[PDB]
Every structure is written in C-alpha cells, then in structure tokens.
Amino acid sequence: SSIGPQIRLDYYYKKALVDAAKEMYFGQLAEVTNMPKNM
Amino acid sequence: PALTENGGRRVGFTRIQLIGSIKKFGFFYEWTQEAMDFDTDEELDS
C-alpha cells in the first residue's frame, strides 16, 4: 500500500497491437470485371 | 283536405339521413438487388 488509495494503477497504452495482413500470394493475377447490367 | 266554415283542426314533414363510408385500400411488391443487377432488361424498375 501507500499514503492513500490510488485509483489508476495501470497506464493504458492507446496504440494497440493489431496483426498484419496476410500476403496476397495467390491473388497476384489479373482482375477482369463483369458488366453490372444484364450478364 | 276539407275546410268547413267552422275550422279549428293537420300535416307534418320528415327528413331522412344518408350515410357514406371511407375504406382503406392499397398493395405493394418487393424485389431483390440481384433481380435488378442480373436482369435481361435494364429498365425493369421503370
């Protein structure tokens, strides 16, 4: 303990640890589009 | 009627009532997005 009860006892680091993005290995080829209308 | 020379004693009048009514009516229809995108016609919505 200490002189008096302290409320906050842990610094919350705002910057979080998010995982990276898996490398787009297979998706490294052409991208043909389909016409919205009809088809 | 027959008014004798004496007189002394008749007709009445009546009115009737007419009543209407308001009735609600309507309908609706639905469609999916895919119906519009993958339709042979491009003016189906119109």
Coordinates of all heavy atoms in Angstrom, one line a residue, unseen atoms left out:
Chain A
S1 N 0.8 -1.2 0.0 CA 0.0 0.0 0.0 C 0.9 1.3 0.0 O 2.1 1.2 -0.2 CB -0.9 0.0 1.2 OG -2.0 0.9 1.0
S2 N 0.2 2.4 0.2 CA 0.9 3.7 0.2 C 0.2 4.7 1.1 O -0.5 4.3 2.0 CB 1.0 4.2 -1.2 OG -0.3 4.3 -1.8
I3 N 0.5 6.0 0.9 CA -0.1 7.0 1.8 C -1.6 7.0 1.7 O -2.3 7.0 2.7 CB 0.5 8.4 1.4 CG1 -0.4 9.5 2.0 CG2 0.6 8.5 -0.1 CD1 -0.3 9.6 3.5
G4 N -2.1 6.9 0.4 CA -3.5 6.8 0.2 C -3.9 5.9 -1.0 O -3.0 5.7 -1.9
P5 N -5.1 5.4 -1.0 CA -5.5 4.6 -2.1 C -5.5 5.4 -3.5 O -6.1 6.5 -3.6 CB -7.0 4.3 -1.8 CG -7.0 4.3 -0.3 CD -6.1 5.5 0.1
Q6 N -4.7 4.9 -4.4 CA -4.6 5.5 -5.7 C -5.5 4.7 -6.7 O -5.6 3.5 -6.6 CB -3.1 5.4 -6.2 CG -2.9 5.8 -7.7 CD -3.0 7.3 -7.9 OE1 -2.3 8.1 -7.2 NE2 -3.9 7.8 -8.8
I7 N -6.2 5.5 -7.5 CA -7.3 4.9 -8.3 C -6.7 4.2 -9.5 O -6.9 3.0 -9.7 CB -8.3 6.0 -8.8 CG1 -8.7 6.9 -7.6 CG2 -9.5 5.4 -9.5 CD1 -8.2 8.3 -7.5
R8 N -6.0 4.9 -10.4 CA -5.4 4.4 -11.6 C -4.0 3.8 -11.3 O -3.1 4.5 -10.9 CB -5.3 5.4 -12.7 CG -6.7 5.9 -13.2 CD -7.5 4.8 -13.8 NE -7.6 4.8 -15.2 CZ -7.1 4.0 -16.1 NH1 -6.4 2.9 -15.6 NH2 -7.2 4.1 -17.4
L9 N -3.9 2.4 -11.5 CA -2.7 1.7 -11.2 C -2.1 1.1 -12.4 O -1.2 0.3 -12.3 CB -2.9 0.7 -10.1 CG -3.8 1.1 -8.9 CD1 -4.0 -0.1 -8.0 CD2 -3.2 2.2 -8.2
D10 N -2.5 1.4 -13.6 CA -2.0 0.8 -14.8 C -2.2 1.8 -16.0 O -3.4 2.2 -16.2 CB -2.7 -0.5 -15.1
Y11 N -1.2 2.2 -16.7 CA -1.2 3.1 -17.8 C -1.7 2.3 -19.0 O -1.1 1.3 -19.4 CB 0.1 3.7 -18.1 CG 0.3 4.2 -19.5 CD1 -0.4 5.3 -20.0 CD2 1.1 3.5 -20.4 CE1 -0.3 5.8 -21.3 CE2 1.2 4.0 -21.7 CZ 0.5 5.1 -22.1 OH 0.6 5.6 -23.4
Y12 N -2.8 2.7 -19.6 CA -3.4 2.1 -20.8 C -2.8 2.6 -22.0 O -3.0 3.8 -22.3 CB -4.9 2.2 -20.8 CG -5.5 2.1 -22.2 CD1 -5.5 0.9 -22.9 CD2 -6.1 3.2 -22.8 CE1 -6.1 0.8 -24.1 CE2 -6.6 3.2 -24.0 CZ -6.6 2.0 -24.7 OH -7.2 1.9 -26.0
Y13 N -2.0 1.8 -22.7 CA -1.4 2.3 -24.0 C -2.4 2.3 -25.1 O -3.0 1.3 -25.4 CB -0.2 1.3 -24.4 CG 0.6 1.8 -25.5 CD1 0.9 3.2 -25.7 CD2 1.1 0.9 -26.4 CE1 1.6 3.6 -26.8 CE2 1.9 1.4 -27.5 CZ 2.1 2.7 -27.7 OH 2.9 3.1 -28.7
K14 N -2.7 3.5 -25.6 CA -3.7 3.7 -26.6 C -3.4 2.9 -27.9 O -4.3 2.3 -28.4 CB -3.9 5.2 -26.9
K15 N -2.2 3.0 -28.3 CA -1.8 2.2 -29.6 C -1.9 0.7 -29.3 O -1.1 0.2 -28.5 CB -0.5 2.7 -30.0
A16 N -2.8 0.1 -30.1 CA -3.0 -1.4 -29.9 C -2.1 -2.2 -30.8 O -1.5 -1.7 -31.7 CB -4.4 -1.7 -30.2
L17 N -2.0 -3.5 -30.5 CA -1.2 -4.4 -31.3 C -2.1 -5.2 -32.2 O -2.7 -6.2 -31.8 CB -0.4 -5.3 -30.4 CG 0.5 -6.4 -31.1 CD1 1.7 -5.7 -31.8 CD2 1.0 -7.4 -30.2
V18 N -2.3 -4.8 -33.4 CA -3.1 -5.5 -34.4 C -2.2 -6.3 -35.3 O -1.1 -5.9 -35.6 CB -4.0 -4.5 -35.2 CG1 -5.2 -4.1 -34.4 CG2 -3.2 -3.3 -35.6
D19 N -2.7 -7.5 -35.7 CA -2.0 -8.3 -36.6 C -1.8 -7.7 -38.0 O -2.6 -6.8 -38.4 CB -2.6 -9.7 -36.7 CG -2.0 -10.7 -35.7 OD1 -1.5 -10.3 -34.6 OD2 -2.1 -11.9 -36.0
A20 N -0.8 -8.2 -38.7 CA -0.6 -7.6 -40.1 C -1.6 -8.3 -41.0 O -2.5 -9.0 -40.6 CB 0.9 -7.9 -40.5
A21 N -1.4 -8.0 -42.3 CA -2.3 -8.6 -43.4 C -1.5 -9.7 -44.1 O -0.4 -9.5 -44.5 CB -2.7 -7.5 -44.3
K22 N -2.1 -10.9 -44.1 CA -1.5 -12.0 -44.8 C -1.2 -11.6 -46.3 O -2.1 -11.0 -47.0 CB -2.4 -13.2 -44.7 CG -3.0 -13.5 -43.4 CD -2.8 -14.9 -43.0 CE -3.2 -15.2 -41.5 NZ -4.7 -15.2 -41.4
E23 N 0.0 -11.9 -46.7 CA 0.4 -11.6 -48.1 C -0.5 -12.2 -49.1 O -0.8 -13.4 -49.1 CB 1.8 -12.0 -48.3 CG 2.7 -11.8 -47.1 CD 2.9 -13.0 -46.3 OE1 1.8 -13.6 -45.9 OE2 4.0 -13.4 -46.0
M24 N -0.9 -11.3 -50.1 CA -1.9 -11.8 -51.1 C -1.1 -12.6 -52.2 O -0.9 -12.2 -53.3 CB -2.5 -10.5 -51.8 CG -3.7 -10.8 -52.7 SD -5.0 -11.9 -52.2 CE -5.2 -11.6 -50.4
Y25 N -0.7 -13.8 -51.7 CA 0.2 -14.6 -52.6 C -0.6 -15.1 -53.9 O -0.2 -14.7 -55.0 CB 0.6 -15.9 -51.8 CG 1.7 -15.7 -50.8 CD1 1.5 -15.6 -49.4 CD2 3.0 -15.5 -51.2 CE1 2.5 -15.4 -48.5 CE2 4.0 -15.3 -50.3 CZ 3.8 -15.3 -49.0 OH 4.8 -15.1 -48.1
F26 N -1.7 -15.8 -53.7 CA -2.4 -16.3 -54.9 C -3.1 -15.2 -55.6 O -3.1 -15.3 -56.9 CB -3.3 -17.4 -54.4 CG -2.7 -18.8 -54.3 CD1 -3.1 -19.6 -53.2 CD2 -1.7 -19.2 -55.2 CE1 -2.5 -20.8 -53.1 CE2 -1.2 -20.4 -55.0 CZ -1.5 -21.3 -53.9
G27 N -3.6 -14.2 -54.9 CA -4.3 -13.1 -55.6 C -3.4 -12.1 -56.2 O -3.5 -10.9 -56.0
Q28 N -2.4 -12.6 -57.0 CA -1.5 -11.7 -57.7 C -1.6 -11.8 -59.2 O -0.6 -11.7 -59.9 CB 0.0 -12.0 -57.3 CG 0.4 -11.3 -56.0 CD -0.1 -9.9 -55.9 OE1 -0.9 -9.6 -55.0 NE2 0.4 -9.0 -56.8
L29 N -2.9 -11.9 -59.7 CA -3.1 -12.1 -61.1 C -4.2 -11.1 -61.6 O -4.5 -10.2 -60.8 CB -3.5 -13.5 -61.4 CG -2.5 -14.6 -61.5 CD1 -1.4 -14.2 -62.5 CD2 -1.9 -15.0 -60.1
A30 N -4.6 -11.3 -62.8 CA -5.5 -10.3 -63.5 C -6.8 -10.2 -62.8 O -7.3 -11.1 -62.1 CB -5.7 -10.6 -64.9
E31 N -7.5 -9.1 -63.0 CA -8.8 -8.8 -62.4 C -9.8 -8.3 -63.5 O -9.8 -7.1 -63.8 CB -8.7 -7.7 -61.3 CG -9.7 -7.9 -60.2 CD -10.1 -9.4 -59.9 OE1 -9.2 -10.1 -59.5 OE2 -11.3 -9.7 -60.2
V32 N -10.5 -9.3 -64.1 CA -11.5 -9.0 -65.2 C -12.8 -8.7 -64.5 O -13.2 -9.3 -63.5 CB -11.6 -10.1 -66.2 CG1 -12.2 -11.3 -65.6 CG2 -12.4 -9.6 -67.4
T33 N -13.5 -7.7 -65.0 CA -14.8 -7.3 -64.4 C -15.9 -7.8 -65.2 O -15.8 -8.1 -66.4 CB -14.9 -5.7 -64.3 OG1 -15.9 -5.4 -63.4 CG2 -15.1 -5.1 -65.7
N34 N -17.0 -8.0 -64.5 CA -18.3 -8.5 -65.1 C -19.2 -7.3 -65.2 O -19.4 -6.6 -64.2 CB -18.9 -9.6 -64.3 CG -20.1 -10.3 -65.0 OD1 -19.9 -11.3 -65.7 ND2 -21.3 -9.8 -64.8
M35 N -19.8 -7.1 -66.4 CA -20.7 -6.0 -66.6 C -21.9 -6.0 -65.6 O -22.6 -7.0 -65.6 CB -21.2 -5.9 -68.0
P36 N -22.1 -5.0 -64.8 CA -23.2 -4.9 -63.9 C -24.6 -5.2 -64.6 O -25.3 -6.1 -64.2 CB -23.2 -3.5 -63.4 CG -22.0 -2.9 -64.3 CD -21.1 -4.0 -64.2
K37 N -24.9 -4.4 -65.6 CA -26.1 -4.5 -66.4 C -26.1 -5.9 -67.1 O -25.1 -6.3 -67.6 CB -26.2 -3.4 -67.4
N38 N -27.3 -6.6 -67.0 CA -27.5 -7.9 -67.6 C -26.4 -8.8 -67.2 O -25.9 -8.8 -66.1 CB -27.6 -7.7 -69.1 CG -28.7 -8.6 -69.7 OD1 -29.0 -9.7 -69.3 ND2 -29.3 -8.1 -70.8
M39 N -26.1 -9.7 -68.2 CA -25.0 -10.7 -68.0 C -25.1 -11.4 -66.6 O -24.2 -11.2 -65.7 CB -23.6 -10.0 -68.1
Chain B
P1 N -108.1 17.6 -48.3 CA -108.5 18.4 -47.2 C -109.9 19.0 -47.3 O -110.4 19.1 -48.4 CB -107.4 19.6 -47.2 CG -107.0 19.6 -48.6 CD -107.0 18.2 -49.1
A2 N -110.5 19.3 -46.2 CA -111.9 19.9 -46.3 C -112.1 20.9 -45.2 O -112.4 20.6 -44.1 CB -112.9 18.7 -46.2
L3 N -111.9 22.2 -45.5 CA -112.1 23.2 -44.6 C -113.5 23.6 -44.4 O -114.1 24.3 -45.3 CB -111.2 24.5 -45.0 CG -110.8 25.4 -43.8 CD1 -110.6 24.6 -42.5 CD2 -109.6 26.2 -44.2
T4 N -114.2 23.1 -43.4 CA -115.5 23.5 -43.1 C -115.5 25.0 -42.7 O -114.5 25.6 -42.3 CB -116.2 22.7 -42.0 OG1 -117.4 23.3 -41.5 CG2 -115.2 22.6 -40.8
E5 N -116.7 25.6 -42.7 CA -116.8 27.0 -42.4 C -116.5 27.3 -40.9 O -116.2 28.4 -40.5 CB -118.3 27.5 -42.7 CG -119.3 26.5 -42.4 CD -120.7 26.9 -43.0 OE1 -121.4 27.7 -42.2 OE2 -121.1 26.5 -44.1
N6 N -116.5 26.2 -40.1 CA -116.1 26.4 -38.7 C -114.5 26.5 -38.6 O -114.0 27.5 -38.2 CB -116.6 25.2 -37.9 CG -117.9 24.7 -38.3 OD1 -118.9 25.5 -38.2 ND2 -118.0 23.5 -38.8
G7 N -113.9 25.4 -39.0 CA -112.4 25.3 -38.9 C -112.0 24.9 -37.5 O -112.8 24.8 -36.5
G8 N -110.7 24.8 -37.3 CA -110.1 24.6 -36.0 C -109.1 23.4 -35.9 O -108.1 23.5 -35.1
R9 N -109.3 22.3 -36.6 CA -108.4 21.2 -36.7 C -108.4 20.6 -38.0 O -109.4 20.2 -38.6 CB -108.7 20.2 -35.6 CG -108.5 20.7 -34.1 CD -108.2 19.5 -33.2 NE -109.3 19.0 -32.5 CZ -109.3 17.9 -31.8 NH1 -108.2 17.2 -31.6 NH2 -110.5 17.5 -31.2
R10 N -104.4 18.4 -40.3 CA -103.0 18.7 -39.9 C -102.0 17.9 -40.7 O -102.3 16.7 -41.0 CB -102.9 18.5 -38.4 CG -101.6 19.1 -37.8 CD -101.6 19.0 -36.3 NE -101.6 17.6 -35.9 CZ -101.0 17.1 -34.8 NH1 -100.4 17.9 -33.9 NH2 -101.1 15.8 -34.5
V11 N -100.9 18.5 -41.0 CA -99.8 17.8 -41.8 C -98.5 18.0 -41.1 O -98.3 18.8 -40.2 CB -99.8 18.5 -43.2 CG1 -99.1 19.9 -43.1 CG2 -99.1 17.6 -44.2
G12 N -97.6 17.1 -41.5 CA -96.2 17.1 -40.9 C -95.2 17.0 -42.0 O -95.5 16.9 -43.2
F13 N -93.9 17.0 -41.6 CA -92.8 16.9 -42.6 C -91.7 16.1 -41.9 O -91.5 16.1 -40.7 CB -92.3 18.3 -42.9 CG -93.4 19.3 -43.3 CD1 -93.9 20.1 -42.4 CD2 -93.8 19.3 -44.6 CE1 -94.9 21.0 -42.8 CE2 -94.8 20.1 -45.0 CZ -95.4 21.0 -44.1
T14 N -91.0 15.4 -42.8 CA -89.9 14.5 -42.4 C -88.7 14.7 -43.2 O -88.8 15.1 -44.4 CB -90.3 13.0 -42.4 OG1 -90.1 12.5 -43.8 CG2 -91.8 12.8 -42.1
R15 N -87.5 14.3 -42.7 CA -86.3 14.3 -43.4 C -85.5 13.0 -43.1 O -85.6 12.4 -42.0 CB -85.4 15.5 -43.1 CG -85.2 15.7 -41.6 CD -83.9 16.4 -41.3 NE -83.9 17.1 -40.0 CZ -83.6 16.5 -38.8 NH1 -83.2 15.2 -38.7 NH2 -83.6 17.3 -37.7
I16 N -84.8 12.5 -44.1 CA -84.1 11.2 -44.0 C -82.6 11.4 -44.0 O -82.1 12.5 -44.4 CB -84.5 10.2 -45.1 CG1 -84.1 10.7 -46.4 CG2 -86.0 9.9 -45.0 CD1 -83.9 9.6 -47.5
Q17 N -81.8 10.4 -43.6 CA -80.4 10.6 -43.4 C -79.7 9.6 -44.4 O -80.1 8.5 -44.6 CB -80.0 10.2 -42.0 CG -78.5 10.3 -41.7 CD -78.2 10.1 -40.2 OE1 -78.0 9.0 -39.7 NE2 -78.2 11.2 -39.5
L18 N -78.6 10.2 -45.0 CA -77.7 9.4 -45.9 C -76.4 9.3 -45.2 O -75.8 10.3 -44.7 CB -77.6 10.0 -47.2 CG -79.0 10.5 -47.8 CD1 -78.8 11.4 -49.1 CD2 -79.8 9.3 -48.2
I19 N -75.8 8.1 -45.3 CA -74.5 7.8 -44.6 C -73.6 7.2 -45.6 O -73.9 6.2 -46.3 CB -74.7 6.9 -43.4 CG1 -75.7 7.5 -42.4 CG2 -73.4 6.7 -42.7 CD1 -76.9 6.5 -42.1
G20 N -72.3 7.7 -45.7 CA -71.3 7.1 -46.5 C -70.3 6.4 -45.7 O -70.5 6.1 -44.5
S21 N -69.1 6.1 -46.3 CA -68.0 5.4 -45.6 C -66.7 5.6 -46.4 O -66.8 5.5 -47.6 CB -68.4 3.9 -45.4 OG -68.6 3.3 -46.7
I22 N -65.6 5.7 -45.7 CA -64.3 5.7 -46.3 C -63.6 4.4 -46.0 O -63.5 4.0 -44.8 CB -63.5 6.9 -45.8 CG1 -64.3 8.2 -45.7 CG2 -62.3 7.2 -46.7 CD1 -64.5 8.9 -47.0
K23 N -63.1 3.7 -47.0 CA -62.5 2.4 -46.8 C -61.0 2.6 -47.3 O -60.8 3.2 -48.4 CB -63.2 1.3 -47.6 CG -64.6 0.9 -47.0 CD -64.7 1.2 -45.5 CE -63.9 0.2 -44.6 NZ -63.8 0.7 -43.2
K24 N -60.1 2.0 -46.6 CA -58.7 2.0 -47.0 C -58.4 0.9 -48.0 O -58.9 -0.2 -47.9 CB -57.8 1.8 -45.8 CG -56.3 2.1 -46.0 CD -55.6 2.3 -44.7 CE -54.4 3.2 -44.9 NZ -53.4 3.0 -43.7
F25 N -57.5 1.2 -49.0 CA -57.1 0.3 -50.0 C -55.6 0.5 -50.4 O -55.2 1.6 -50.3 CB -58.0 0.4 -51.2 CG -59.4 0.1 -51.0 CD1 -60.3 1.1 -50.9 CD2 -59.9 -1.2 -50.8 CE1 -61.7 0.9 -50.7 CE2 -61.2 -1.5 -50.6 CZ -62.1 -0.4 -50.5
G26 N -55.0 -0.6 -50.8 CA -53.6 -0.4 -51.2 C -52.9 -1.8 -51.3 O -53.5 -2.8 -50.9
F27 N -51.7 -1.8 -51.9 CA -51.0 -3.0 -52.1 C -49.5 -2.6 -52.2 O -49.1 -1.5 -52.0 CB -51.4 -3.8 -53.3 CG -51.3 -2.9 -54.6 CD1 -50.2 -3.0 -55.4 CD2 -52.4 -2.1 -55.0 CE1 -50.2 -2.2 -56.6 CE2 -52.3 -1.4 -56.1 CZ -51.2 -1.4 -56.9
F28 N -48.7 -3.6 -52.5 CA -47.2 -3.4 -52.6 C -46.6 -4.6 -53.3 O -47.2 -5.6 -53.6 CB -46.6 -3.2 -51.2 CG -46.4 -4.5 -50.5 CD1 -45.1 -5.1 -50.5 CD2 -47.4 -5.1 -49.7 CE1 -44.9 -6.3 -49.8 CE2 -47.2 -6.3 -49.1 CZ -46.0 -6.9 -49.1
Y29 N -45.3 -4.4 -53.6 CA -44.5 -5.5 -54.2 C -43.0 -5.3 -53.8 O -42.6 -4.3 -53.3 CB -44.6 -5.5 -55.7 CG -44.2 -4.2 -56.4 CD1 -42.9 -4.0 -56.8 CD2 -45.1 -3.2 -56.5 CE1 -42.5 -2.8 -57.4 CE2 -44.7 -2.0 -57.1 CZ -43.4 -1.8 -57.6 OH -43.0 -0.6 -58.2
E30 N -42.3 -6.4 -53.9 CA -40.9 -6.4 -53.5 C -40.0 -6.9 -54.6 O -40.4 -7.6 -55.6 CB -40.7 -7.3 -52.3 CG -41.7 -7.2 -51.2 CD -41.8 -8.4 -50.3 OE1 -41.2 -9.5 -50.7 OE2 -42.5 -8.4 -49.3
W31 N -38.7 -6.6 -54.5 CA -37.7 -7.1 -55.4 C -36.4 -7.1 -54.7 O -36.1 -6.3 -53.8 CB -37.6 -6.2 -56.7 CG -37.0 -4.8 -56.4 CD1 -35.7 -4.5 -56.4 CD2 -37.8 -3.6 -56.1 NE1 -35.6 -3.1 -56.1 CE2 -36.9 -2.6 -55.9 CE3 -39.1 -3.4 -55.9 CZ2 -37.2 -1.3 -55.6 CZ3 -39.5 -2.1 -55.5 CH2 -38.6 -1.1 -55.4
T32 N -35.5 -8.1 -55.2 CA -34.2 -8.2 -54.6 C -33.2 -7.3 -55.5 O -33.5 -6.9 -56.6 CB -33.7 -9.6 -54.6 OG1 -33.4 -10.0 -56.0 CG2 -34.8 -10.5 -54.1
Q33 N -32.0 -7.1 -54.9 CA -31.0 -6.4 -55.7 C -30.6 -7.2 -56.9 O -30.4 -6.7 -58.0 CB -29.8 -6.1 -54.8 CG -28.7 -5.3 -55.4 CD -29.2 -3.9 -55.7 OE1 -29.6 -3.5 -56.8 NE2 -29.1 -3.0 -54.7
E34 N -30.4 -8.5 -56.7 CA -29.9 -9.4 -57.7 C -30.9 -9.4 -58.9 O -30.5 -9.6 -60.1 CB -29.7 -10.8 -57.2
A35 N -32.1 -9.2 -58.6 CA -33.1 -9.1 -59.7 C -32.8 -8.0 -60.6 O -32.9 -8.1 -61.9 CB -34.5 -9.0 -59.1
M36 N -32.4 -6.8 -60.1 CA -32.1 -5.6 -60.9 C -30.7 -5.8 -61.6 O -30.6 -5.4 -62.7 CB -32.1 -4.4 -60.0 CG -33.1 -4.5 -58.9 SD -34.7 -5.2 -59.4 CE -35.2 -3.9 -60.6
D37 N -29.7 -6.3 -60.9 CA -28.4 -6.4 -61.5 C -28.4 -7.4 -62.6 O -27.8 -7.1 -63.6 CB -27.3 -6.7 -60.4 CG -27.6 -6.1 -59.1 OD1 -27.4 -4.9 -59.0 OD2 -27.9 -6.8 -58.1
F38 N -29.0 -8.6 -62.4 CA -28.8 -9.7 -63.3 C -30.1 -9.9 -64.2 O -30.4 -11.0 -64.5 CB -28.5 -11.0 -62.6 CG -27.4 -10.8 -61.6 CD1 -27.5 -11.4 -60.4 CD2 -26.2 -10.1 -61.9 CE1 -26.5 -11.3 -59.4 CE2 -25.2 -9.9 -60.9 CZ -25.4 -10.5 -59.7
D39 N -30.7 -8.8 -64.6 CA -31.9 -8.9 -65.4 C -31.6 -8.6 -66.9 O -30.6 -7.9 -67.2 CB -32.9 -7.9 -65.0 CG -34.3 -8.1 -65.6 OD1 -34.9 -9.1 -65.2 OD2 -34.7 -7.3 -66.4
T40 N -32.3 -9.3 -67.8 CA -32.1 -9.1 -69.2 C -32.4 -7.6 -69.6 O -31.7 -7.1 -70.4 CB -33.0 -10.0 -70.0 OG1 -34.3 -10.0 -69.4 CG2 -32.4 -11.4 -70.0
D41 N -33.4 -7.0 -69.0 CA -33.7 -5.6 -69.2 C -33.0 -4.7 -68.2 O -32.9 -5.1 -67.0 CB -35.2 -5.4 -69.2 CG -35.6 -4.0 -69.8 OD1 -34.9 -3.6 -70.8 OD2 -36.5 -3.4 -69.2
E42 N -32.6 -3.5 -68.6 CA -32.0 -2.6 -67.7 C -33.0 -1.4 -67.3 O -32.6 -0.5 -66.6 CB -30.7 -2.0 -68.3 CG -29.6 -3.0 -68.4 CD -29.6 -3.9 -67.2 OE1 -29.2 -3.5 -66.1 OE2 -30.0 -5.1 -67.4
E43 N -34.2 -1.5 -67.8 CA -35.2 -0.5 -67.4 C -36.4 -1.2 -66.7 O -37.5 -0.7 -66.8 CB -35.7 0.2 -68.6
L44 N -36.2 -2.3 -66.1 CA -37.3 -3.1 -65.4 C -37.9 -2.2 -64.3 O -39.1 -2.2 -64.1 CB -36.8 -4.4 -64.9 CG -37.7 -5.4 -64.2 CD1 -37.2 -6.8 -64.3 CD2 -37.9 -5.1 -62.7
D45 N -37.1 -1.5 -63.5 CA -37.6 -0.7 -62.4 C -38.6 0.4 -63.0 O -39.6 0.6 -62.4 CB -36.4 0.0 -61.7 CG -35.5 0.8 -62.6 OD1 -35.9 1.0 -63.8 OD2 -34.5 1.2 -62.1
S46 N -38.2 1.0 -64.1 CA -39.1 2.0 -64.7 C -40.4 1.3 -65.2 O -41.5 1.8 -65.1 CB -38.4 2.7 -65.8 OG -38.4 1.9 -67.0

